[PDB]
Amino acid sequence: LSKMSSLLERLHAKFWSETIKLVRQVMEKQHLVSCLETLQKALKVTSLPAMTDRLESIARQNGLGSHLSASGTECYITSDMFYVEVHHGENPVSCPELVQQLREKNFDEFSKHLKGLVNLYNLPGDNKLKTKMYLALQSLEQDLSKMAIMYWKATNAGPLDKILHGSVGYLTPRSGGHLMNLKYYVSPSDLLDDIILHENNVSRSLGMNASVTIEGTSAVYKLPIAPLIMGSHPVDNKWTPSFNSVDLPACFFLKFPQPIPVSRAFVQKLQNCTGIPLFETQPTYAPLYELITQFELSKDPDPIPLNHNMRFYAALPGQQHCYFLNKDAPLPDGRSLQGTLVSKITFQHPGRVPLILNLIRHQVAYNTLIGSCVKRTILKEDSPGLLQFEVCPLSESRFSVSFQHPVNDSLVCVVMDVQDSTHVSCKLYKGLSDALICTDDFIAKVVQRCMSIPVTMRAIRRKAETI
Amino acid sequence: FLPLVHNIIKCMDKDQDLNALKSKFQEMRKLISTMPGIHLSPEQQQQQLQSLREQVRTKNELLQKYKSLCMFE
Amino acid sequence: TRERLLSALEDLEVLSRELIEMLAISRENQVLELLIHRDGEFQELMKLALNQGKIHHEMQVLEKEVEKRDSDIQ
Amino acid sequence: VNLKQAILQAWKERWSDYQWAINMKKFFPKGATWDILNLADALLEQAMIGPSPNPLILSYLKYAISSQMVSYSSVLTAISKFDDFSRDLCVQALLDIMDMFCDRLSCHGKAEECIGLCRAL
């Protein structure tokens, strides 16, 4: 449309040397040109100074200072982040991640790495403390490394045990802009794909993660600037006490990529274990089952909201299931299970990080058991089957799945309590005059092998119907 | 094509007429690469190729028929 | 296809000149993006042109075989 | 058909207590004051199976007391037949149900119902 009048004014131009002479006279006499350049870096052909130009464009894009010394060597330069492609330290590592991205045509991941390296050193201090602040992170990282190695000294456990029940976790050290990732949990479903063997080339995203970092806060805290574990209790870790240290206006963080919904009693348990307040302002509490459903539905997004009204449907092989997750059922205190989304847990010194993680592992395990109901499969109002189930919270870390007896007509309620990360105990609750359905250890076996409600309910139904 | 326009923009950020006339001469080279010898739509090229394939097939089949056929014994 | 090639040529020519000239008189992202589209489509048509050149060489060999079989028939 | 099946259908499709009352009327043409059919017994059995009572069937029983569907005598007998006593939550629920009708405890019927209220007390 506008191109038609553009071609008409172009026909008027046919009816430019004077324009070049005008540009020359102005030469004898900003943002737009560089913006067009940064759009057009996509269309540059592969060549050595052109790739230097596109890397300079990445530098201008993420706010960093480019400097070439040749067509080979180009430096990205800011107050501490200084590295080349061919402050206060060497250029440490020829890291294969950045080189592997740049040897291919993967410049956006290079941009993400420079974004992460900006967000590491964007701390508010006058730059001197910044160095010391980064040093504190280094000390923390070293301590964290030792603890995982201490666990590897303790038992020669596989990576799965290192994830599920060990100290720290599967620990990927930092490399470029990617900060240090602890994998504290991987579910029995998310372990499997479409039956994964878990050998030490395990994926970064294969589970639930938490990245450790430093961040400037509004308060002042005392953090170590030295590797705090010089002496190690041979099966534990043991920390020499503080001061060294200095009172940086910052704190360590465990940032989760996807915010975890946690209950109120979790908030008090973690503020007891840490000592530092978690929610600086008090947030707006919500029922946990809303947040669990928003978490599980916002895993795989679609533009249509499900409009569930807490009545989820499950299409299974030899069965069809319905679930009522039943928020606002009252606890013994008289209130529903109220929780909020946590994303950043602040700790001061690294000895807290196993205990903290055990708490989060507990919480994440509980969410997976309530995560298995939240599905998008709509087998709406099918007259065959639709075994109508209910989930209610009797307490923190306990819940109950209530459902019709497969033989008789009284209710049967299976109460599940999540003791630890991989241990969930189960009790069948039955009328005094009913049929034998299952033993509790069978329910514990199916739960710990699958970590999903509907699979265990089908196991209950099938082992009832064989008898 | 377009990286020369990029160099003209880079020269404008630096400051010229030379690369502009080189772009004009490049469009003259574009005329020389419009010379080749193809003018029909590619559908018409496909029609011509299929018709000529059928022609060579039927002519070879006729000549093979008269290779094999003797009117006399 | 020559008409579409040449229209893309002259359009690219004088509209890129317009973009250069408005840069020069300033010291227009939409017509920029359309120039990007015209450049890509022109390069695609040049690839189709080289393919049709291969097709025409095949056609020349094929019509030589046509004339040889015609001479055998006659 | 049975009272257990009607209460259990009332649990399956979520019925509010008044819709439960209407559909309970519709399932059974003879009311039989609902105490011949032992409404309080079936509601207490299928409410007190878990460690904690499901609030749906307790809401059904609290409506069936506050509205005068079920006499106090049948409720007090069905409360008396529970024991177990290892679960404090079910016992607290039974004491709230007793907190509803106690101090009121007024039969308005035949004298045999009043004798039944005496034995139930």
Q: What is the DSSP string of B8-49?
A: HHHHHHH---HHHHHHHHHHHHHHHTT-SS--S-HHHHHHHH
Pairing verdict, β A245-246 and A208-216: unpaired
**Chain D residues with CB within 8 Å of chain A CB:** 2, 4-5, 8, 11-14, 45-46, 49-52, 54-55, 89
Residue indicated by tokens 């052909």: A45
What residues are paired with A263 via a beta bridge?
A339
Whole-angstrom distance, CA of residue A189 vs CA of residue B22: 63
What are the E-state strand segments in A54-99?
Answer: 65-68, 74-77, 82-85
Residue A254's DSSP bridge partners are A212, A345
Chains B and A touch (3+ CB pairs under 8 A): yes
Find out whether A85 and A176 touch, Cβ atoms under 8 Å.
no
Distance in angstroms (rounded) separating the CA atoms of residues A284 and A280: 12
Q: Which long-range contacts (CB under 8 A, 24 or more apart) does A10-14 make?
A: A10/C11, A10/C14, A10/C15, A10/C17, A10/C18, A11/C14, A13/C14, A13/C17, A13/C18, A13/C21, A14/C14
* Distance (Å) of CA B54 to CA B48, B49, B57, B60, C62: 10, 9, 5, 10, 11
A317, HSE (Cβ side, Cα atoms, 13 Å): 6
Instruction: For the sheet with A320-324, list strands across it.
Output: A311-315, A320-324, A387-395, A398-404, A411-418, A424-429
| Cα–Cα dist A229/A212, whole Å | 18
Resolution (Å units) = 4.4
Where do the H-state alpha helices sit in chain D?
Answer: 3-12, 17-27, 39-45, 55-66, 72-80, 88-101, 111-120
Contact between D65 and D75 under an 8 Å Cβ cutoff? The reply is yes
Helix (H, G, I), strand (E, B) or coil at A278: coil
Q: Give A389's strand partners.
A: A323
Residue carrying structure tokens 């002496």: A231
Cα four-point dihedral sign D35, D36, D41, D42: negative
Among residues A333, A325, A339, the alpha carbon closest in space to that of A287 is found at A339
Q: What are phi and psi of A156, to 5 degrees?
A: -90, 65
How far is residue A275's CA from residue A271's CA, in Å, rounded to a whole number?
5
Using the Cα atoms of residue D115, residue D116, residue D117 and residue D118 in order, give the sign of their dihedral: positive
Q: Which residues contact A65 (CB under 8 A, 6 or more apart)?
A: A59, A76, A77, A78
- CA atoms of A148 and A145, how far apart (whole Å): 6
Q: Which two tokens stand for residue A156?
A: 């020669």
Distance (Å, rounded) from C-alpha D83 to C-alpha D81?
6
What is the C-alpha separation between A74 and A86, in angstroms, rounded? Answer: 7
Q: Flag if B49 and C70 touch (Cβ within 8 Å).
A: no
Indicate the length of chain B as a whole number: 73
Residue A30, SS3? coil
Coil, helix or strand at residue D38: coil
Could you tell me which chain B residue has the CA closest to the CA of C54? B38
A18-41 burial: b if 16+ Cβ within 10 Å, else e: ebbeebeeeeeeeebbeebbeebb
Q: Is A31 helix (H, G, I), strand (E, B) or coil?
A: helix
Query: What does the DSSP 8-state code read for residue A175?
Result: B
The candidate with the shortest Cα–Cα distance to A182, out of A190, A173, A192, is: A173
Q: Tell me the torsion sign for CA atoms A313, A316, A320, A322.
A: negative
Q: Which two tokens stand for residue A273?
A: 């274990």
Alpha-helical segments (H) within chain C: 2-26, 29-73
In this complex, is the C-beta atom of B4 within 8 Å of any C-beta atom belonging to chain C?
no
Could you tell me the sign of the dihedral formed by the alpha carbons of B59, B61, B64, B69, in that order? negative
Minimum Cα–Cα distance from A402: chain D residue = D50
Q: Which of A222, A208, A331, A215 is nearest to A280 (CA)?
A: A215
User: Coil, strand or helix: which one is D109?
Assistant: coil
C69 touches B at CB < 8 Å: yes
Is the dihedral angle over the CA atoms A374, A380, A385, A388 positive or is it negative?
A: positive
C66 closest CB neighbour out of B8, B34, B56 = B56
Q: Which residues of B2-41 are buried (b: 16+ CB within 10 A; e: fewer)?
A: beebbebbbbbeeeeeebbeebeeebeebeeebeeebeee
Asked if residues A430 and A464 have their Cβ atoms less than 8 Å apart, the reply is no
CA distance B21 to C29: 24
Residues ≥6 apart with Cβ < 8 Å to D56: D10, D11, D14
* The two three-digit tokens of residue A289, written as one number: 């089952």
The answer to whether A271 and A356 have CB atoms below 8 angstroms apart is no
Residue A253 backbone dihedrals phi, psi, to 5 degrees: -135, 150
Q: What are residue A84's DSSP bridge partners?
A: A75
In sequence order, what are the residues at sequence separation of 6 or more whose Cβ sits closer than 8 angstroms to the Cβ of residue B13?
A33, A34
Cα-based distances in Å from A282 to A340, A455, B19 = 10, 38, 64
Q: Which residue has the tokens 């790495």?
A: A113
Separation between Cα atoms, residue A437 and residue A164, nearest integer Å: 31
3-state secondary structure of A402: strand
Distance in angstroms (rounded) separating the CA atoms of residues A293 and A370: 8
Decide: A453 and A369 in contact? Cβ < 8 Å.
Answer: yes
Contact A169, A184 (CB under 8 A): yes
The letter for the amino acid at A365 is A
| Residues contacting residue D10 through CB under 8 Å, at least 6 positions apart | D20, D23, D24, D56, D57, D60
- CA triple A76-A82-A88, angle to 5 deg: 165
CA dist., res. A221 & res. A140, Å (int): 15
Query: Which chains are adjacent to chain B, needing at least 3 Cβ pairs under 8 Å?
Result: A, C
A48-62 helix and A31-40 helix, angle to the nearest 10 degrees: 120
The beta strands (E) that lie in A309-467 are given as: 311-315, 320-324, 338-347, 387-395, 398-404, 411-418, 424-429
Interstrand relation of A82-85 and A74-77 (parallel, antiparallel or unpaired): antiparallel
- A276/A459 Cα distance (integer angstroms): 44
| Chain-chain contact of A39 with C36 (C-beta, under 8 angstroms) | yes
Chain D: partners with 3+ C-beta pairs within 8 Å: A
Q: How far is CA A399 from CA A414, A425, A426, D18, in A?
A: 9, 11, 10, 28
Distance CA A347, CA A272 (A): 11
Residue A264: strand, helix, or coil: helix
Cβ atoms of D42 and D24 within 8 Å: the answer is no
Asked whether the beta carbons of A460 and A437 are under 8 A apart, the reply is yes
Cβ distance of B38 and C2 shorter than 8 Å: yes
Q: Is D93:D49 a contact under the CB 8 Å cutoff?
A: no
Pairing of strands A245-246, A180-185: unpaired
What contacts A461, CB < 8 A, 6 or more positions away?
Answer: A319, A387, A406
Contacts from C20-23 at CB under 8 Å and sequence distance 24+?
C20/A16, C20/A19, C20/B5, C20/B8, C20/B9, C20/B20, C21/A13, C21/A16, C21/A19, C23/A32, C23/A33, C23/B9, C23/B12
- Which residues in chain C touch residue B42, judged by CB atoms under 8 angstroms apart? 1, 48, 51-52, 55
Distance of CA A211 to the CA centre of its chain: 8
Q: Please check whether residue B18 touches A, CB under 8 A.
A: no
Measured CA to CA, the distance from residue B65 to residue A298 in angstroms comes to 73
Question: Measured between alpha carbons, how far apart are the two ends of chain A, in Å?
Answer: 75
**Does A25 contact B at CB distance below 8 Å?**
no
Mutate one of D3, D9, D14, D52 to test the A interface: name it (highest A CB count within 10 A): D52
In terms of Cα–Cα distance, which of A377, A463, A376, A381 is closest to A414?
A463
Burial of A436 (0-12, 13-18, 19+ CB in 10 A): exposed
Query: In whole angstroms, how large is the CA radius of gyration of chain D?
Result: 14
Among residues A302, A299, A324, which one has the least CA distance to residue A312?
Answer: A324
The C-alpha angle with vertex A76 and arms to A71 and A79, in degrees rounded to 5, equals: 150
Q: What angle do CA B38, B39, B45 make, to 5 degrees?
A: 75
Q: What are phi and psi of A401, to 5 degrees?
A: -110, 115
Residues listed for chain A: 467
Residues A391 and A401 sit within 8 Å (Cβ to Cβ):
yes
CB contact under 8 A, A431 and D5: no
Closest CA to A190 of A299, A352, A107: A299
Structure tokens at A401: 């799945």
CA–chain centroid gap for A91, Å, is 29
Neighbours of A384 (CB within 10 A): 6
The chains in contact with chain C, meaning 3 or more Cβ pairs closer than 8 Å, are A, B
Calpha distance A402→A455 (Å, rounded): 15
CA-wise closest residue to D7 among D29, D22, D19, D24: D24
